[PDB]
Structures are given as structure tokens and as C-alpha cells.
Symmetry: C3
Subunit: 310 residues, 3 copies
């Protein structure tokens, strides 16, 4: 006695199947999932009739569809995505001041901070899987998008996390090709040193948080040199620096990432500049005319910059 169901790797190309009720899913399909739940070792139930089941690439049709949708060969990917998903579908994604956040759960403050930021910067993912989920995230269905993020960064639920690290991995799969930065390092001894970055390395800097400062001058070892921004072409810039007490002034930035705690007691909050300043702490929300605290990331809007130096 057999029933009718669907298998897929992308949840777009559905493949029609007739499962033997006695035999388990695993026997027939190998690794098999039902909205994250690993159903490899259980046997086809009745309620399953005409439901969609994620399976592993175990033929050429599914090996293509997978790579086409996910832009990855890693045969562990689905496993960890489905694992991640099984948890993230039980997380709460409340609307907070227009934005999909996450109620705090499983040290996920860094995923929340990522998710709030991604809704406020111009960006387009190269993988369909990521672009699709990024749309349905902004809507309010951000479970999938989170699972994919955890998957793409090889993180697991409960694992501690870094916003800046996560943004980096995600910007690999963003279309940032036409983004461009030009930096110049002036020592009176060793002369000049200019660099021309494209892609991810064009938008991210680790050293200071103030973008205005980054244009004027920044002191570094070669004794000391002067680093400044020559040309920036990108829709945003991310300015990261080791967490330090810093005053955020309204409307001088897009959003920021706060980090209290030191080791495994570390917590990210998200600050966003709107009509006034809002601090998004998962499901909780504060307002002030100005903000002071340990900031580690700051995002700034940009179109085209050129410096008035030499």
C-alpha cells in the first residue's frame, strides 16, 4: 500500500514519487526532510500524502538543481541548512520599528543584528536560494533566510557568532563586483602606498568606526604612517573596530552594531538612525535623541566619493 508525495533539493522543481508504506523514507530516498525534521528513519505516515520532502543530491537532475539554486558543491550543505532550519522555524520574528528582528534564543543576537542591517543596505545575492529567502525575510518569513545564513557560514544553532565575520561570508555571495575603493598610506620615510580593492574588500574596513576620520587621516605602523580614503564607489561602507565606548550622533550613519561582554558573555544589540535613534535588542526596543556604548560596526550610505588631498 503506497502514497503520493514530492521530493526536491530547491523546493521549486518538485519530483513526483510513490513511497512504499512499510519501508522507511531513508531506505527509498536516503537523507529525507519534512520542513527541517529528519524523517530518514521513520516510515511514510498518512498525513504526508502530497507533501514536499527535501532529499540529498542522489542523481544528476538533483546535483544540477542544487548547484543552480545554492551556488555550492558542499555535499554537507543541505544537512546543516535543514538542521539549522529545524530550530529557526521555532524562533519568533517580530516586526520592530518596520524591521524583522528575532526574539533572543540560542545566542542568535548576531543573526538578529545581521538581519536588521541587511534590511537597511542596498545588496543583491548571487545565489537564488539567498535572494529568494532575503525577499521573504523582509516580508516576515525570515526562518529560511536565517537557516541559509547559518548554513553558508558553517555555523550551528547555539554557537556564538560575529556580525562582521557573518557579513563578510554573506558579501562573498553578494554582487559587489562594480564596488571599488582607493586607499593611500603616506610616510615621510617610505613615501606613498595606494591600493585598488574590488568586490567584498572594497566596502569592509577593520581599524576605526568614523567614516569622516577615514577620509581625513588614520595613524598606523610602517614608527607611524597616515592612511586616508582617495576614492569610494559603493552603495554602503562597513566600518568595524574592536568594541570601544563611542557616541553615535543621529543621522550621521545608517545603522550600527553594539557589543557588551568579553568572552562567552558577549551580546550584540542593533542601533538604527531614523527620525530619532532606536536600539533594537531582539524583541525589545528603546529610543533616545543620542546614544553612547561599545560599538564594533557602523554602516554608512555612499554613492561616489573623491578626496580633496594632493
Amino acid at each position: 500500500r503506497t502514497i503520493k508525495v514530492f521530493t526536491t533539493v530547491d523546493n521549486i522543481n518538485l519530483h513526483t514519487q510513490v513511497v512504499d508504506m512499510s519501508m522507511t523514507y531513508g531506505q527509498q530516498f536516503g537523507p529525507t526532510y519534512l520542513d527541517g525534521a529528519d524523517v530518514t528513519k521513520i516510515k511514510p505516515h498518512n498525513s504526508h500524502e502530497g507533501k514536499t520532502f527535501y532529499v540529498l543530491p542522489n542523481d544528476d537532475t538533483l546535483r544540477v538543481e542544487a548547484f543552480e539554486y545554492y551556488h555550492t558543491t558542499d555535499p554537507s550543505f543541505l544537512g546543516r541548512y535543514m538542521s539549522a532550519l529545524n530550530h529557526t522555524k521555532k524562533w519568533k520574528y517580530p516586526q520592530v520599528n518596520g524591521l524583522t528582528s528575532i526574539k533572543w534564543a540560542d545566542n542568535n543576537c548576531y543573526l538578529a543584528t545581521a538581519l536588521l542591517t541587511l534590511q537597511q543596505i542596498e545588496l543583491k545575492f548571487n545565489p537564488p536560494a539567498l535572494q529568494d529567502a532575503y525577499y521573504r525575510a523582509r516580508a516576515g518569513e525570515a526562518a529560511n533566510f536565517c537557516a541559509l545564513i547559518l548554513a553558508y557560514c558553517n555555523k550551528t544553532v547555539g554557537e556564538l557568532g560575529d556580525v562582521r565575520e557573518t557579513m563578510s561570508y554573506l558579501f562573498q555571495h553578494a554582487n559587489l563586483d562594480s564596488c571599488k575603493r582607493v586607499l593611500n598610506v603616506v610616510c615621510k620615510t617610505c613615501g606613498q602606498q595606494q591600493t585598488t580593492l574590488k568586490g567584498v574588500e572594497a566596502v569592509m574596513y577593520m581599524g576605526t568606526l568614523s567614516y569622516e576620520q577615514f577620509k581625513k587621516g588614520v595613524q598606523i605602523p610602517c614608527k607611524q604612517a597616515t592612511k586616508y580614503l582617495v576614492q569610494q564607489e559603493s552603495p554602503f561602507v562597513m566600518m568595524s573596530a574592536p568594541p570601544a565606548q563611542y557616541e553615535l550622533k543621529h543621522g550621521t550613519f545608517t545603522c550600527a552594531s553594539e557589543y557588551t561582554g568579553n568572552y562567552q558573555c558577549g551580546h550584540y544589540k542593533h542601533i538604527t538612525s531614523k527620525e530619532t535613534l532606536y536600539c533594537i535588542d531582539g524583541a525589545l526596543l528603546t529610543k533616545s535623541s543620542e546614544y553612547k556604548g561599545p560599538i564594533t560596526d557602523v554602516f554608512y550610505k555612499e554613492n561616489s566619493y573623491t578626496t580633496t588631498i594632493k
Copy 2:
């Protein structure tokens, strides 16, 4: 070959003659020795006449398992044995009459559950859980903990919630004959009374004070309303609320659950009302005439209540 026992329940022992060359796995599939996964190792000497947990791989063991555990989930044993392998190394000291746990692997929430379960009238429907619950009260609380972790799909080290844990456990408790009746009075939308049975009858999330729950509580309807208790029939009630500063007065409650810390830095302590107030913090024990602190659960003794409203 040597003589050993396989079982799924550790009650029906099945006599076996294991080939010394071949590993356990080859002969039995997944095989465990007090939690330790011995699927890949070969029968040793010291094993003679020891009891080994195996997976349901025939109809005798498929029945015994479901009869004892009240679940068909073929991952259950795996996670129970995994859990067990750790919990058998935990310390379970007696603290003011009660089996606690020395702090280990973020287990403060299991400790708090365990201390509570010893102070509220309850009967588990699964034998596995009832059996272990008896041997827990005695002092052998390793198994009971493993089963709790198992039944709640938690793993060791995983952060935990007392209230969430109690809920999952009360699913397998016999609470059928428990009954609650609640009434919500708005001057706009009139009256609204509800008749809950089972788990939903004993647990409430909103406020900690049981006395206040009988008088009145304010909630949204585009207006706010008045919620009060009409009838309660159960041996205890659990009053949960988001952790908040609250004053515990001696002998106005059975036990409580305290929660300090915010994100992954959260700690549960257990407070119990006896001749005075005792705070059980794993293996540590304090006493005061009164207590003030962030409480999130309070348990109250009850037989039968009816309101004069």
C-alpha cells in the same frame, strides 16, 4: 564466546552469547553499556553477565520499548543513552531533604525541575518516567534526568527553561481530571469564560501571585479587560511570568524558580518554603526569614477552589 544481557527497558533482560572476535555492533546493531556507545568495540572479559541496551531490531523489543517509553521515535534511545553517558558523572547531593545537582553543563534548569517535581503531587503515564521518578526521590536521579533531556529533545550543555521543561513533562503526567475555569469581563465585549482540561489547567503565563489571579488581572480585549479564576481542581498550580523582582513570603507558596542573567548568562536557583525559606543553588544552600529576587515560576498547593464573584 561469553554470556551477557540485551534489553530496551532494563526490566525484560534477554540472554545472549556474543562472539569475542566480532564487535557488538555486527551482532546487535547500536549497543550501549551504561550510556557508553560500545557498537564499534569487541566483547571484553569484564562484560560477562552485564546488561547492554540495544535498538528495537525485532518485534519483542519493538513492543517492550513502546510499552515502557510510550514513544515510537527511533532516535529516542540514542539521545537518552547520550544524555545518560553525561548525567551518570553529575553529583546528586541531598539538600534539605531534596535531590539537587551540583552545577555542570548549564544544568541549573534540570536541578530546579528535579527539586520542584519532589514537592508537587504527580504521576507519569510512561513507566520509564515513573520508575526513574521514584529512584530520583531516593537519590539515584541520573536516569530520571537523562529521560527528561530525552523526552524534551534537549542535549547536555544546551541552555534550558524550567517552565518549558515542566510543560513537556506534564504532557506525560496523568492530569486528565484537572480542570480550570477563567472569566474575562470587559464593559464593551461582555463576559468570556473558558474550560481548560489537562496540562493547560495547571500552568498560566502572565503573573506569579495566585491570590491576585483570583481577584483580578488586566489584559487587552481596542480596550483592557479583567481576568479572574472561577474554579480550580488540581493538586498544584504553576504561575509563570517573565522574570521580575518579587517578594516571597514564607508559607504562601510551595516552591519557586529564580532567574538572574539575561541572554546566555542566565542562572536558575530554586526557593522552597519549609520551617523557613531555603534557596537551593545546586549543591549550595541559603536560609532567610524572607526572600526578594527575580522569580519566573511559583508553585502553589491546591485541592478545589470556587470564587465568591
Copy 3:
């Protein structure tokens, strides 16, 4: 279409292999690793030609080589070592005041504290795998050594840890056989009680941190406990974390512990020309130190009491 690679369990006995490009590694070898990375499920790539791959003991040659090198029959060992390794190779091991530390990651403060201590106390591992890695640790390549420690102690990455617990498991595999301690407990009621410990139990004590005090007298259920004879290159004095003042050059190194439950942090203090506090990649100096200490290591050759 096939390429040439090497399989091994010890990375000393290399076994030459010709892998089918279509089939994955797993199909051909079972569990297969490339510097920790589990490559059981991926197929032989291009870059791999003439690289060394860790495999599981799946014949008697590799079952011997493994036990010879690791001194353990636990058939899970390599799995967890390679798993551990896959993370520890991404950790930073900076030099700090002469010593290989670790930048903080995955609650690893206790591994850092162990590692800093092991560089400052005379010790020899019985497993080759551990001695080999302990040399390459002191040099600066401490990824392997850490993986092996995590492996040998049945810990995983991110798992919370105890310095004293870790030292114990490690001293099992240290050659401490000729180490010896003699303790005497004097009650005016129940008379005298002396004990003769050898091996690991000879160097470790849980009760107080002061070695000088341990020689004079210590009160227990009361009675008086004192050290009669000590023969070992170091002693470890552990006690539940408590405020304690460290005086320069009265000890080798210590272990600090702030925090209570899962918020606990180990720092390492070392006595050199002055006092240095190693907190992973961070470094402090003071003329004196006061803080919650739980372990203190002392240099010793041969002690005998005048009591």
C-alpha cells in the same frame, strides 16, 4: 581517470594509493580527512595529487600504527581528534612573553591556561603523538597538541573546561611513575595517619593553594595535615576559586578564575622578572597580583620536613 595520494593514521607511516576520480574518498577508504576537514563525502579533486590524508583504522597495519602512536584502542579517537583539529587550526597561537598562548575562541581560556603552564613545568608524554605535538607546540604550531588534548580528555570545541581536570587526564599519559609524596594527619584523639602516593596523585592536591602552608600545617575533620616527603619536578596546588595575593618568585605560574556558572573565565599568571597576566592574546604586568586563583604550580626537586 585516477591520481596518486597518501593515507596514514600517524603521519609517519605513509601508505601510497591510486584513487578513482568518479568515486568519493569515503567509498574507497571510509572516514578520510585532509588537515581535519572531513572529505568522506567529496570526490578526489585536482589540488590533492600527492597530499597526505588521515583515514580510520580499517585493517591490521593501521590498527597497530594507531595504537603504537596514540596509546589508545578507542575507535572514536581519530574522528574526534580530526573534528577538534578542524577548528583548532583556525585559532591564533601568538607568542606572549616567550610562551605560545591562544586568542580567545570557543571557551578555550582553559586550554590556553593548560598550554601556558605545560611550557613551564618539566614533563614527558608516554604517547609519541602527544610528545611530538608538545615539541611543535613550544615552537608555535600548537593546533595539533590542542586537538590531541581535547581528544584525550573526551572534550569538544566550545565545551566549557577545567584546567585542573585537564592537567589530571594529561598527567595519566605523562611519565610520573618515579614521583612520590608522603602526607601525615595528626589528631590528639585518633593518633597519626601517613599515606604513600605515587604517579599522578603525588603532584596534585585539592584543598589549599599555599605550598609553604602545606608543609607547616592544615586543619581538616579536627586534625593537622602536613607534607612529610615530596619527590617530583613540580607540585600543583588547587582550591575552590578564592581571593589570594601572589608574591613575585614564590611560585612558577597560577590559574585565575572569575565568573560563577557558564560565565567563568581563566587567566594565566606567571612569575618572571616581574608578574605577567596572560589573558589569551592580551598581556598585563604588575609588581604584585591579587585575584581569584584556583591553581598554583611550584618548582620542586626533593623535600623532607623537620617535624
